[PDB]
Amino acid sequence: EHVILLNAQGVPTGTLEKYAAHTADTRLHLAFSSWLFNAKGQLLVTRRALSKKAWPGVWTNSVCGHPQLGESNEDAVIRRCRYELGVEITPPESIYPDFRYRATDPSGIVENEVCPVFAARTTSALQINDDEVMDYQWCDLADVLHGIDATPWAFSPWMVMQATNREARKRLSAFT
Numbered sequence: 001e002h003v004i005l006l007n008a009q010g011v012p013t014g015t016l017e018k019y020a021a022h023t024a025d026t027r028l029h030l031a032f033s034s035w036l037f038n039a040k041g042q043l044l045v046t047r048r049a050l051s052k053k054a055w056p057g058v059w060t061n062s063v064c065g066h067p068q069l070g071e072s073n074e075d076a077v078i079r080r081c082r083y084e085l086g087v088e089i090t091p092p093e094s095i096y097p098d099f100r101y102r103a104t105d106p107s108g109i110v111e112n113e114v115c116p117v118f119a120a121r122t123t124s125a126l127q128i129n130d131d132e133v134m135d136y137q138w139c140d141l142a143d144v145l146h147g148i149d150a151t152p153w154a155f156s157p158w159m160v161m162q163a164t165n166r167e168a169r170k171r172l173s174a175f176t
């Protein structure tokens with residue numbers, strides 16, 4: 001696996017091996033986030049495994065990852081859902097296409113990402129890959145946005161920043 005590197009204008013400049021790309025000074029690169037919802041409209045919140053290099057053991061939105069050369073964002077969403085969660089989904093929908101953030105984890109690993117955000121509904125049962133996910137919960141969207149506004153440090157920085165965008169929050173609601 002790799003990440004697709006980008007310049008300040010969002011123009012691909014090459015690739016780097018995924019694990020090696022995330023450091024104390026992570027170069028800007030291509031990622032996605034997806035918010036997964038069940039038939040009942042409940043959001044899937046996941047706790048990343050303790051083995052993840054960046055933000056291990058951290059509560060976060062359903063599935064995030066890094067698109068590869070030649071892959072659309074939406075196919076990246078699909079592949080990681082199957083890979084991390086064992087689960088089929090409806091076509092991912094755009095929720096926040098221009099999200100970009102940079103952040104430092106407790107051990108000082110930076111994420112530096114142009115990170116389009118998607119939403120989808122699950123269409124099969126989860127089958128959890130515990131190399132990726134250590135814990136999950138189905139819940140009410142509004143409950144999660146209240147935890148986020150009250151205790152942001154309890155969640156991943158990209159989750160909080162995503163959910164705190166006025167329009168992104170309004171689209172996630174409408175989605176449910």
Ligand SMILES: CN(C)CCOP(=O)(O)OP(=O)(O)O
Pocket residue numbers: 031032033052054064065066080111113115158
């Ligand atoms: C929002 N960022 C973190 C994009 C995806 O992050 P992960 O750390 O889940 O990446 P991957 O599943 O590719 O290891």
Ligand SMILES: [Mg+2]
Pocket residue numbers: 063064065080084132
């Ligand atoms: Mg992931």
Ligand SMILES: [Mn+2]
Pocket residue numbers: 003022029031066111112113
């Ligand atoms: Mn990254």
